[PDB]
Amino acid sequence: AMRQCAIYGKGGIGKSTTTQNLVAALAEMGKKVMIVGCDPKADSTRLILHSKAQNTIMEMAAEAGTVEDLELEDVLKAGYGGVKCVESGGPEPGVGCAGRGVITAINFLEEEGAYEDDLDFVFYDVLGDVVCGGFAMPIRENKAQEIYIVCSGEMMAMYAANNISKGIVKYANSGSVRLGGLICNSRNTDREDELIIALANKLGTQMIHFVPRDNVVQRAEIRRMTVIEYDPKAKQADEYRALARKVVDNKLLVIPNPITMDELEELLMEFGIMEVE
Amino acid sequence: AMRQCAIYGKGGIGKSTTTQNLVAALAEMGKKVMIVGCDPKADSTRLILHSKAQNTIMEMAAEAGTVEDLELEDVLKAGYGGVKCVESGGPEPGVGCAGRGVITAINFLEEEGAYEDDLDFVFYDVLGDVVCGGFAMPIRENKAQEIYIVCSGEMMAMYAANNISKGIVKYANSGSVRLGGLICNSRNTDREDELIIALANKLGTQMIHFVPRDNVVQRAEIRRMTVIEYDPKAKQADEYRALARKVVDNKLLVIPNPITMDELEELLMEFGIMEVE
Ligand SMILES: Nc1ncnc2c1ncn2[C@@H]1O[C@H](COP(=O)(O)OP(=O)(O)O)[C@@H](O)[C@H]1O
Numbered sequence A, B: 001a002m003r004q005c006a007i008y009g010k011g012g013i014g015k016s017t018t019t020q021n022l023v024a025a026l027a028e029m030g031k032k033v034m035i036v037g038c039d040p041k042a043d044s045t046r047l048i049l050h051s052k053a054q055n056t057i058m059e060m061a062a063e064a065g066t067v068e069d070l071e072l073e074d075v076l077k078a079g080y081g082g083v084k085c086v087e088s089g090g091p092e093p094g095v096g097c098a099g100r101g102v103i104t105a106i107n108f109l110e111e112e113g114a115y116e117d118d119l120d121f122v123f124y125d126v127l128g129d130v131v132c133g134g135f136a137m138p139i140r141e142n143k144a145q146e147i148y149i150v151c152s153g154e155m156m157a158m159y160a161a162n163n164i165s166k167g168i169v170k171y172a173n174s175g176s177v178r179l180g181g182l183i184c185n186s187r188n189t190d191r192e193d194e195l196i197i198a199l200a201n202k203l204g205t206q207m208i209h210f211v212p213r214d215n216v217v218q219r220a221e222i223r224r225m226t227v228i229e230y231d232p233k234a235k236q237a238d239e240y241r242a243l244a245r246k247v248v249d250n251k252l253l254v255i256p257n258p259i260t261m262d263e264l265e266e267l268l269m270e271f272g273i274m275e276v277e
């Protein structure tokens, strides 16, 4: 068995940083993990690979001729802790559907046998600002059974969490895609943890971890590393280890209860977020 | 003549706040303005209308039967300063293309004669995290001749600005869509203004205004108002008046020069952004 997990969230919220650090912690534990980048930014594996980014399946297929001329051994790349990494890519802006490369990538990986019995986890790092096309495919096509949403006390981040939850509800009749939890990537604001806990409770899930804002992340990323690799003794490394432990142990996978915009606004007002100075 | 402008940018960067405040300042000056919401969040007109949000063309068409059963006089709503407001809407998450409602809305507005000679400006408030489907339509179909990108020293915000610029370049052979400038919506970080000026120069454009981070925005928005209406004497009101003046006077509309990710990273490192504590 392997657990298929997808990390969703609005752009810039911390999906790739959180995913790569969580996965590094899992590898440090002895888990075998694959990361599948499903964001056109295509930098979802750079901290595992110590790289600028990674050439995408869409790019490699175009240079090879067709995706079928690609071999899995040429596409997947291993980095820190033996974590295997692949990037979907996507069309250039203004051309075709930004999510089209995700469909091509996931189907290629399945056909080519990337989902070897030995994997313990697959993480898809998925753009979440729209829930359509290839970005909806992990949910619509039952590819990621456990969705974790990175979010913060930002209204936009919570709105995205609600929209992703609506997509999960839409496809609940088929497959087994469920919301596994919210991950609060802190903006260093008062009561933020309480706010995301409250949002999670309203959606029917939980806040699986509160990730502090910590500049060690920037220092590690400037060096193309997870915090786990860059400074295993960092306080922030232990934060990602705690998140990884809780993901491993998590058994709550729900069909979420999307909320109204009135409920979101009440949450913000209640927890004095919009009133913090 | 009327100037057709589109405000693009990543989610949560400040498009709707900036657009509505800029437009309120234009109306305060005596300009006639229409705002067309092109973001599924569909709250791009609430501060002009003093409202929760606005019912969308997609919603109204579904209740009426077809979009052709709708009348312009039932769709457009006027708020502060006589500013006319409409929201496109979009499909629910997981269903169909998130941008489909933008195509329906803009075509409806054109067919129904919303672009009356008396308008001085139309502003489209467009989701910019992907540049495809209906979100690319204002560029692809030559609807917004002047694109202004709201951005900040956030790497994701600058990446979005570059991707939108790539979309402008893609469609430069036809129509007349051009990049008019970057608007820095400040994160209260050192040298941010210099950073966005540098990015603008690399793209071939300009930073048309640096909008400070100011909590009066939250206080006005809690009351469903632009700062312009809420407190015309606020320092931030004068900031939006300065932005509006510079938009009115702006004559630089370029085919931009998208940059590499290496150039973006160098910009961040140069201006010690990622190294600010
Ligand atoms: N917990 C954190 N502390 C400090 N910086 C963070 C943290 N999480 C993310 N970041 C920073 O935020 C930026 C965006 O994170 P990223 O993971 O790339 O977002 P996404 O993948 O959701 O677009 C990066 O510069 C990263 O260094």
Ligand SMILES: Nc1ncnc2c1ncn2[C@@H]1O[C@H](COP(=O)(O)OP(=O)(O)O)[C@@H](O)[C@H]1O
Pocket (backbone or CB within 6 Å): A155, A156, B009, B010, B011, B012, B013, B014, B015, B016, B017, B018, B185, B186, B211, B212, B213, B214, B215, B217, B218, B221
């Ligand atoms: N200059 C500013 N100062 C303070 N808060 C701001 C400013 N600009 C935007 N905001 C806040 O940021 C949030 C997102 O702005 P919004 O315009 O809704 O973003 P977008 O439309 O790009 O998703 C809102 O809560 C708004 O109050």
Ligand SMILES: [Mg+2]
Pocket (backbone or CB within 6 Å): A015, A016, A017, A039, A041, A043, A044, A125
């Ligand atoms: Mg990312």
Ligand SMILES: [Mg+2]
Pocket (backbone or CB within 6 Å): B015, B016, B017, B039, B041, B043, B044, B125
């Ligand atoms: Mg908006």
